Subunit: 130 residues, 3 copies
């Protein structure tokens, strides 16, 4: 489904903050006792609207809210950390949750290079005829 | 292993309640501020004992308790939400956790349709003989 | 990467404690009301330094701390239980997260036994010639 920004405005640039899971620690800075305080663990970056990604992203987050709110309504977990892990699992189950019928539309198996390994090796049983 | 109900009685019908992860929201009902209170988020349904599923299910839950209690004894999590996700992961690891030896018993790869794509395409190298 | 113990000493034996997820319960011992208290749920064992595993293990845990501390710094979860599950998911995504190109280096599909099922069944179309 296409994402069409339907907001009164779009800030086309995204000045973001995040954390780094394992920033190349400098010396002992990784030791909690010596390291940064809560305020100083953030990195920043600036992204522009190439391919319209920023305006699309603002619209996507907006459109995500209904399903996210409904998901939160139905869970009894107080804080939910597992959405991305569950999506990773669902990505795998959609592809590998059943028998992979080769050359079927729902089987992500490419036998290309290797059909050329047997059809190319027929001239070792037909052309080798003596 | 077969499930054999060994209870003094069986209620053969299951009047159930659950939640819907993303019920087709009507208007603004999905907004927590406007939506139902805790008591009003439930859907209901009624299932009968076709194939003996209800009596089997009551027995299954009964038999599950020992292993579930022992699992809970050994975890330090206060509330456990991850059992089904872990079972999904284990489903995948059992099938795809090693090398898939095609036509082996533990490899869920069907090369059927496509063995008929090469054995059917031999008459393009043997019957085409000129 | 090789693990080289660089500690002042190594205790070469590991007297360990753990829990058993589902110990073969004896009678009603699995019922929380009747079962062991927190102190009595542990099993023990003793492992020696065969293959240098114990000294390697002490070094591995030591070397793991930087990345583990940095991971903990960047999470907002108060208690983290999901590291091993996430590693299991990542194990699967590395192998099955894309299209599996058979006989490619990142495709864990063995067509061995079964290339001998078609190359062995050529003498049913070539040697059967009449
Ligand atoms: C995702 O993006 C959507 C588009 O920006 C957001 O839609 C907003 O939704 C709220 C309600 O949830 C609307 O607020 C209502 O506004 C009406 C009318 O407001 C004035 O404007 C009309 C002309 O449209 C005018 O004729 C009226 O007389 C009002 O003066 C109020 O009557 C309601 O009580 C209510 O306040 C927003 O207007 C609406 N925005 C737009 C641009 O349509 C949506 O909220 C976003 N989702 C999230 C989760 O943020
Ligand atoms: C799963 O289903 C099982 C089958 O319904 C449940 O088994 C129940 O287990 C409890 C103990 O955990 C038993 O309670 C005991 O009962 C005996 C005897 O009770 C009376 O009956 C005998 C005849 O059988 C009679 O001769 C006696 O004199 C008694 O008058 C008591 O002595 C014990 O102290 C204890 O209370 C249940 O009897 C038993 N039910 C059945 C139908 O066997 C099991 O509990 C279920 N699991 C869960 C987790 O719910
Ligand atoms: C993983 O294993 C590593 C190797 O065992 C551990 O390395 C330890 O790291 C701490 C700091 O994080 C060091 O403590 C420092 O020690 C120096 C010097 O101590 C004395 O020794 C030198 C000779 O090396 C001597 O010349 C000095 O005058 C000192 O008398 C202090 O100056 C610092 O203030 C600080 O205390 C350990 O020395 C170091 N151990 C070794 C064997 O190198 C590492 O800690 C382990 N990681 C975890 C998470 O446990
Ligand atoms: C469906 S994946 C997707 C969707 C939208 C955008 C992008 C990727 N990326 C990078 C992701 C970015 C997202 C926000 C947090 C920091 N990270 C790096 C980007 C790169 C350059 C300009 C704009 C954008 S927006
Ligand atoms: C091993 S999967 C399994 C095992 C037992 C039953 C069923 C599936 N289903 C539907 C599942 C049902 C379970 C309870 C919560 C609501 N959902 C829909 C069923 C359908 C119709 C009559 C009886 C049953 S019992
Ligand atoms: C990369 S997997 C790995 C790495 C190091 C060791 C081992 C496996 N095993 C068994 C695992 C053991 C680990 C500690 C908790 C209890 N369990 C059984 C072992 C067997 C016998 C002697 C030494 C060792 S150390």
């Amino acid at each position: 489904e296409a994402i069409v920004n339907a907001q009164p405005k779009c800030n086309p640039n995204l000045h973001y903050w995040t954390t780094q899971d394992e920033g190349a620690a400098i010396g002992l800075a990784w030791i909690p006792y010596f390291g940064p305080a809560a305020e100083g663990i953030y990195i920043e970056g600036l992204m522009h609207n190439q391919d319209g990604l920023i305006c699309g992203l603002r619209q996507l987050a907006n459109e995500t809210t209904q399903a996210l709110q409904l998901f939160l309504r139905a869970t009894t977990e107080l804080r939910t950390f597992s959405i991305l892990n569950r999506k990773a699992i669902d990505f795998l189950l959609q592809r590998w949750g059943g028998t992979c019928h080769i050359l079927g539309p729902d089987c992500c198996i490419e036998p290309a290079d290797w059909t050329k390994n047997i059809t190319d090796k027929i001239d070792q049983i037909i052309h080798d005829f003596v």
